[PDB]
Design an enzyme around this catalytic site. Sequence first.
Site, PDB file in Angstrom:
ATOM      1  N   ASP A  28      -1.856  -0.064   6.054  1.00  0.00           N
ATOM      2  CA  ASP A  28      -2.280   0.508   7.244  1.00  0.00           C
ATOM      3  C   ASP A  28      -3.641   1.041   6.869  1.00  0.00           C
ATOM      4  O   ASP A  28      -3.776   1.306   5.921  1.00  0.00           O
ATOM      5  CB  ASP A  28      -1.206   1.536   7.704  1.00  0.00           C
ATOM      6  CG  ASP A  28      -1.066   2.825   6.833  1.00  0.00           C
ATOM      7  OD1 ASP A  28      -1.270   2.510   5.501  1.00  0.00           O
ATOM      8  OD2 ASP A  28      -0.918   3.869   7.163  1.00  0.00           O
TER       9      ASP A  28
ATOM     10  N   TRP B  59      26.708 -40.209   3.333  1.00  0.00           N
ATOM     11  CA  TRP B  59      26.103 -39.618   2.118  1.00  0.00           C
ATOM     12  C   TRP B  59      26.231 -37.845   2.825  1.00  0.00           C
ATOM     13  O   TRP B  59      26.083 -36.867   1.587  1.00  0.00           O
ATOM     14  CB  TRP B  59      24.713 -39.970   1.899  1.00  0.00           C
ATOM     15  CG  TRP B  59      23.950 -39.033   0.869  1.00  0.00           C
ATOM     16  CD1 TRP B  59      22.965 -38.332   1.153  1.00  0.00           C
ATOM     17  CD2 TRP B  59      24.263 -39.288  -0.337  1.00  0.00           C
ATOM     18  NE1 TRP B  59      22.437 -37.744  -0.028  1.00  0.00           N
ATOM     19  CE2 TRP B  59      23.408 -38.271  -0.965  1.00  0.00           C
ATOM     20  CE3 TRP B  59      24.814 -40.006  -1.299  1.00  0.00           C
ATOM     21  CZ2 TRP B  59      23.341 -37.964  -2.342  1.00  0.00           C
ATOM     22  CZ3 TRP B  59      24.861 -39.626  -2.638  1.00  0.00           C
ATOM     23  CH2 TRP B  59      24.008 -38.812  -3.297  1.00  0.00           C
TER      24      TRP B  59
ATOM     25  N   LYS C 127       0.766  30.033  -9.378  1.00  0.00           N
ATOM     26  CA  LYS C 127       1.356  28.873  -9.144  1.00  0.00           C
ATOM     27  C   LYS C 127       0.588  27.832  -9.752  1.00  0.00           C
ATOM     28  O   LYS C 127      -0.571  27.842  -9.602  1.00  0.00           O
ATOM     29  CB  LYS C 127       1.580  28.705  -7.684  1.00  0.00           C
ATOM     30  CG  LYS C 127       0.325  28.559  -6.780  1.00  0.00           C
ATOM     31  CD  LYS C 127       0.845  28.168  -5.227  1.00  0.00           C
ATOM     32  CE  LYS C 127      -0.659  27.845  -4.293  1.00  0.00           C
ATOM     33  NZ  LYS C 127      -0.543  28.175  -3.065  1.00  0.00           N
TER      34      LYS C 127
ATOM     35  N   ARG D 274      -6.013   4.726  -7.781  1.00  0.00           N
ATOM     36  CA  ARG D 274      -7.463   4.932  -7.455  1.00  0.00           C
ATOM     37  C   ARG D 274      -8.302   3.809  -7.129  1.00  0.00           C
ATOM     38  O   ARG D 274      -9.304   3.585  -7.616  1.00  0.00           O
ATOM     39  CB  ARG D 274      -8.140   5.626  -8.712  1.00  0.00           C
ATOM     40  CG  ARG D 274      -7.342   6.924  -9.488  1.00  0.00           C
ATOM     41  CD  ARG D 274      -7.716   7.988  -8.438  1.00  0.00           C
ATOM     42  NE  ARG D 274      -8.861   8.193  -7.862  1.00  0.00           N
ATOM     43  CZ  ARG D 274      -9.246   9.051  -7.090  1.00  0.00           C
ATOM     44  NH1 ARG D 274      -8.545   9.884  -6.561  1.00  0.00           N
ATOM     45  NH2 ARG D 274     -10.616   8.993  -6.491  1.00  0.00           N
TER      46      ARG D 274
ATOM     47  N   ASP E  16       0.915  -0.975  -0.041  1.00  0.00           N
ATOM     48  CA  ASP E  16       0.050   0.111  -0.213  1.00  0.00           C
ATOM     49  C   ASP E  16       1.054   1.118   0.028  1.00  0.00           C
ATOM     50  O   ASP E  16       2.442   0.998   0.233  1.00  0.00           O
ATOM     51  CB  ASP E  16      -0.952  -0.092   1.271  1.00  0.00           C
ATOM     52  CG  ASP E  16      -1.660   1.186   1.668  1.00  0.00           C
ATOM     53  OD1 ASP E  16      -2.382   1.727   0.693  1.00  0.00           O
ATOM     54  OD2 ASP E  16      -1.465   1.740   2.783  1.00  0.00           O
TER      55      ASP E  16
ATOM     56  N   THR F 143       6.330  18.883  -8.502  1.00  0.00           N
ATOM     57  CA  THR F 143       6.767  20.346  -8.854  1.00  0.00           C
ATOM     58  C   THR F 143       5.485  21.207  -9.289  1.00  0.00           C
ATOM     59  O   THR F 143       4.519  20.691  -9.402  1.00  0.00           O
ATOM     60  CB  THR F 143       7.524  20.006 -10.208  1.00  0.00           C
ATOM     61  OG1 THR F 143       6.741  19.576 -11.223  1.00  0.00           O
ATOM     62  CG2 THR F 143       8.808  19.168  -9.996  1.00  0.00           C
TER      63      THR F 143
END
Lengths: 340, 1064
Positions: free
Chosen positions: B773, B1042, B540, B747, B379, B575
């Site tokens: 988790d 053996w 931005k 998704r 996960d 970014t």
Amino acid sequence: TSKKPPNTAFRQQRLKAWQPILSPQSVLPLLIFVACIFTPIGIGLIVSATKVQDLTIDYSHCDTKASTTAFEDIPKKYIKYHFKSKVENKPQWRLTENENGEQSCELQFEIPNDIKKSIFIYYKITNFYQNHRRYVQSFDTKQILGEPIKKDDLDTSCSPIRSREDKIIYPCGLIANSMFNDTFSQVLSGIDDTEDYNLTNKHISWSIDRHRFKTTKYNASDIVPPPNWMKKYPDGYTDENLPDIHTWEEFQVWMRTAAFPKFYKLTLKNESASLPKGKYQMNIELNYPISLFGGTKSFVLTTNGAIGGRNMSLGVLYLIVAGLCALFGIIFLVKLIFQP
Amino acid sequence: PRVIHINDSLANSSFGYSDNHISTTKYNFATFLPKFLFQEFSKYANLFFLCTSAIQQVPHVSPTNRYTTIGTLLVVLIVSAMKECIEDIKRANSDKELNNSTAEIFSEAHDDFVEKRWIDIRVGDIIRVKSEEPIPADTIILSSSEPEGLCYIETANLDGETNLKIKQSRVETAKFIDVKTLKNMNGKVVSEQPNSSLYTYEGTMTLNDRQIPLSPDQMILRGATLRNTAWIFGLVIFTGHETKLLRNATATPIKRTAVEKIINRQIIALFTVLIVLILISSIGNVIMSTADAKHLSYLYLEGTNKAGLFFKDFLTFWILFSNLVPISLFVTVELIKYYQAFMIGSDLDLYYEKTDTPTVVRTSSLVEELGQIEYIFSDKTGTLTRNIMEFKSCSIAGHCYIDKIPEDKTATVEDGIEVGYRKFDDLKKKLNDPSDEDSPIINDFLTLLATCHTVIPEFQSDGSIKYQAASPDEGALVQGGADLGYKFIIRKPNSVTVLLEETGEEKEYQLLNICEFNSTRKRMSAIFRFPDGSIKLFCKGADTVILERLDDEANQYVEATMRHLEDYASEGLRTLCLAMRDISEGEYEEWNSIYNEAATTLDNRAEKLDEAANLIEKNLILIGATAIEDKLQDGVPETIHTLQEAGIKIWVLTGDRQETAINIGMSCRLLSEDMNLLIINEETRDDTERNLLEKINALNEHQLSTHDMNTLALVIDGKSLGFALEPELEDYLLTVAKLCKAVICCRVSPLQKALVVKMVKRKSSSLLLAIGDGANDVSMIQAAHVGVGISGMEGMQAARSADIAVGQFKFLKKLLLVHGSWSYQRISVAILYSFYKNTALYMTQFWYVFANAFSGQSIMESWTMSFYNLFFTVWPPFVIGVFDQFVSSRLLERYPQLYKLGQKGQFFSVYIFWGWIINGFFHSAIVFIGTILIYRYGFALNMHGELADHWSWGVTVYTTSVIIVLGKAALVTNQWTKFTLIAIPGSLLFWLIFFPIYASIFPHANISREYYGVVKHTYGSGVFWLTLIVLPIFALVRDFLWKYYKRMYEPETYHVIQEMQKYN
Ligand SMILES: CCCCC/C=C\C/C=C\C/C=C\C/C=C\CCCC(=O)O[C@H](COC(=O)CCCCCCCCCCCCCCCCC)COP(=O)(O)O[C@@H]1[C@H](O)[C@@H](O)[C@H](OP(=O)(O)O)[C@@H](O)[C@H]1O
Ligand SMILES: *[C@@H]1O[C@H](CO)[C@@H](O[C@@H]2O[C@H](CO)[C@@H](O[C@@H]3O[C@H](CO)[C@@H](O)[C@H](O[C@@H]4O[C@H](CO)[C@@H](O)[C@H](O)[C@@H]4O)[C@@H]3O)[C@H](O)[C@H]2NC(C)=O)[C@H](O)[C@H]1NC(C)=O
Ligand SMILES: *[C@@H]1O[C@H](CO)[C@@H](O[C@@H]2O[C@H](CO)[C@@H](O[C@@H]3O[C@H](CO)[C@@H](O)[C@H](O[C@@H]4O[C@H](CO)[C@@H](O)[C@H](O)[C@@H]4O)[C@@H]3O)[C@H](O)[C@H]2NC(C)=O)[C@H](O)[C@H]1NC(C)=O
Ligand SMILES: *[C@@H]1O[C@H](CO)[C@@H](O[C@@H]2O[C@H](CO)[C@@H](O)[C@H](O)[C@H]2NC(C)=O)[C@H](O)[C@H]1NC(C)=O
Ligand SMILES: [Mg+2]
């Protein structure tokens, strides 16, 4: 650090351990050392089994093959003897009949040397299943102890030989019913200038069997002999007819059941003096028929060794492991040089 | 419809809804019997002793007791019941830590919120959950401390998404702020049924007079967590196991291993051996007691029939030979696996000291499934990542800056345009002096970090300011501006104040308008008014959207930043590109009317507002780019690489979006830069087929190289995976998944995390591990063969429902490589030894049927045979199964290729099982034939002509069969601790002193009366101490020669690592 596990050598699975490896510096000096200690024991236990000298006479088919009038020679297959010397006269039998239908086989063997050690007398039974599961437990261990056990309080391992005509069979079960009853005469009667050699009938059985087997406590009005004992005890038991199984050593030896269908049972011994060389005779009255079990009853006259007889199979097994370990100490050594 | 009244706990109880408890226990009092018996009577030996004890109940079979097998069958069923009761109490204790937590519930009588437990919550209660504590149930929010009625929930347990969700109250019910006025509202909530679709709710809350609609914008699920809000008022609508997230979780299912599946095929091997030996002895009995009926009249045999006798001794040879299948194996397979799980959870290298949680193995029956693991279904959020973002790098004026420069590229190579790394200290030094060109650009960058956002700050009593950000990347930008020198402080309405630590003076900026974030825009633009009176635009957004909207004639550093956007994506950093432009008032006075064009259309706001803002972002000047890293846990890339060296194919299933899952895989090196990702993002059923077909057409089109296999990866959307798991397209998806090195599913629903793990174990004969988790992957953990959970943090519903709960992800390396491959070689060798040593004693009972006329008589007393699997041969299975280290811990982690020993199954199969039986047949024939030759007529003794009987010989058979099965264990063991030196030579010394004590004391008490003179005639005889020497060495010379030839001239790959361990 409340819930933190402890930092000890046990809990952290780091214990002080030694790790063996099968290096040629370890395996190859082991096989040479095993071979050099299993050969003195291997030759030492074959010499001790060679040193045993005995004599075996299969006296089954004495009823029909033997001669009544004169001592005639026993066939080659019935005699097996091992002695330090050679025999000159091969053993002879004779059949001897008494006043009422009771024959006695008269074996007449020759002992070519003074056997300086103790002499034991056995009888070898073959094809007798003393170790059958129906047979091993079929007695009652309280009647052996001596207490007057009643009929329904008696053991149930005596399955068909429990009670007869609503009376208690005192030696109960199958091991006592099928007892070997060829009476070996208690003296090796010397023939032609050799003296008689007396044997004894006491302290034959185990010492725990002479303590557990005690004289019974029934009076004879309640009890009755086993079905194959009626020829020995006709008209049932009386007070003077009663057998104490405390002093009856042949009963204690037979009731100690054996492991295999070919077994010995000790009957007679002398441990005080040695028998000198000569021609001897053993009278054996033939009560037990071999048609009951289908094997060969026999007369064995043995000496003892450290391993207890003429059996090479222990000193041979010490030589197979000494031969296998000294063979693969060579196969793995020529591979160590020519195939690295 | 779930009709839920608001203010009467007696009214909704008439419906009889569920309670609030959550139980992860395997059993309870209502199904402990039909579930524990099903997992015990699915083992084939427990079925065998149930039909062995049913044969002892017909009357005349065997003189041993009728209750000697079913007594021990209840003994092995009591020990396996108390182990599954010990473990299910520990699961019930961990459920008591959840149901007894505090939850404030309203009271009608008290007219105030009372503090109570979680388990007291009923459907219909009004609850008040405080600031940073989790939600107790599926509640619809009524009010909050925020003015409009909004709150911020974090859904990192019901999803993998790291942002905060805007849950707002309805304005028709946010007027209930005070606790004393909560009593006067009446009405019902017509809710929907329980589902598992998280992002969809439909209801209708009718208030006192008319109905209000409901929607998932005011639905708060149970796994969520309130954040950045003081309190809310919620109405519990689904509780317990009726929630949206914990609906499809169930009780802990029965999990059978692959070792346990082989034992049911080794029992069938041993059972058809058993039917052969019973058929030989029961035909040989009916032949011999018929052909030799005239020579067996001293036994007085009945001789009923040939059919009635054959059907009688068919059972008496069943009971005699039933002890080939050991009943003491299946207690020492449950007690070894329980004592191995105690030793796993006692290791300090798997203890996480930071949150004080050691590893726990809740299901001890699966500690050997960790030794053969083919796949790992991980996960992402919380498992691989720390859920902590951080401003990492900026690149402005054609430069690039980080604080912690690594030494691989500290040398800026000056290849024309500057590429490299400089310190953040040198960023401030070119900010200080005004003679530099970048300093008007650097502060314009550094104000955009601290002003363009939508963070609501708050002060604390210590003075250390905590930022409340709706997205964790924006919060890291403000903190990234804060430690650089531009601290962001008090935000009042319609202006933003920034504290400048460079000069020490506190500035202020007049916020004119901000345009909201949109996934369609992937931008965030903010026009501002300055102390200069000048209007500047801050914007931005991603590199793929604003780089189209620049003036390339104006800015001169665009070519450096796009290459700076290329090495950031090679490390998986998130970014954003930063752009700016000065604008004037006259175009802004019209653009205010363009904002008033969007004020006119309340009917259309998604279409109208955002591109009306984009009217003024037609041209910009680029400042540079930023790089925010999503922090991974400690040691995550080192264990992704090491577990792939062991041949384990690592998949990643997350609930995150697609572009942040690729960014994580590039940072943990699950995906490399020189790899060919096969992205499957389709929306219909057949386009997922057409995408899967053209991928699988273009793979067999070309010959696969040995390195082209390791440069192939797969990326699936959660909508494409919903079609590719259908039975038609199930095989095209799986044949391309086997070729690629790493699979990533994005998704993905909580059920689709389970349907993938079910799809792989159905089609492949491979073992799968699932680590996670949060309660979005409880179904993934309960559907795997081993389910690992992450413990030590809040919302640990996966650490409760799992079989193993570890501290963090990097403990999966030592748990699999060291503790798994140990616990596979341990349980496989200790099982084959226990099958062997039962054969090497109870086969002398079969070679005896040819020497006692096929009667079935035993050669040992049944008390002494019972002491074999109880006293003298119990500890060498335990020391082999708990303390045997075939190769060390530091060499199991240096060579991860040694994980392919267990992964193939090279220590446990039916073919290796036959060699421990054929060695048991061979060892038993040496004991039997070796002792009937020595004890020839009973004439092996030297005690005044007395002989050796049945019981004085069967002690020699028993003792020699002890030194062999203890001599075999001393060749099997790899290391000799102090616990080995008391088990292998301390069980032999136990028997050599137990027997002259037992046989001298117990026959006097009428117990085992066969042993009256046996000690004088075994131990006092010289032939007993000679049969005990040569006859073991006869039988162990083949196992010893053996073992030398196997490691020297034909070694396996671990025989060399053991020689490295010994001599280096
Ligand atoms: C009645 C109905 C039953 C019918 C059943 C019949 C057939 C079964 C059907 C199919 C069987 C299928 C296959 C059987 C064939 C081969 C078995 C697979 C081979 C196999 O791994 O096992 C071997 C047994 O070695 C014999 O072979 C053992 C060799 C001894 C065999 C001798 C022949 C015995 C015959 C019985 C005698 C009966 C006589 C009759 C007497 C009658 C008396 C009246 C295992 O011991 P192994 O010492 O090599 O173990 C090695 C080695 O010890 C160790 O150094 C190494 O690990 P490490 O270095 O890390 O430690 C590692 O290599 C380890 O594996
Ligand atoms: C193992 O070794 C010997 C086997 O030959 C045996 O001892 C020999 O046999 C007897 C038993 O003592 C000895 O001969 C008798 O000696 C006693 C001593 O006083 C004499 O009384 C006796 O005279 C007559 O014996 C008749 C029976 O034969 C009897 O009816 C008369 O009334 C009268 O008593 C014998 O002369 C012989 O000299 C012993 N020889 C040697 C060299 O010892 C052992 O007892 C035997 N041990 C066992 C079986 O335990
Ligand atoms: C030495 O040991 C021999 C074997 O143990 C033993 O030989 C057996 O002896 C018994 C008893 O003498 C024989 O049994 C007889 O069987 C015949 C059938 O052939 C019966 O006529 C008779 O049984 C009768 O049973 C009647 C009720 O049905 C009842 O009226 C009578 O009581 C009567 O007993 C016999 O009992 C048996 O066949 C013998 N051979 C075998 C192979 O078993 C020797 O007698 C014994 N000798 C000595 C001196 O101890
Ligand atoms: C030692 O051997 C002699 C020789 O057989 C035994 O003497 C016999 O004793 C019985 C008992 O009454 C007599 O019926 C025989 O006639 C005796 N035989 C001879 C040749 O005289 C003597 O009993 C043996 N010694 C012991 C102690 O038993
Ligand atoms: Mg997660």
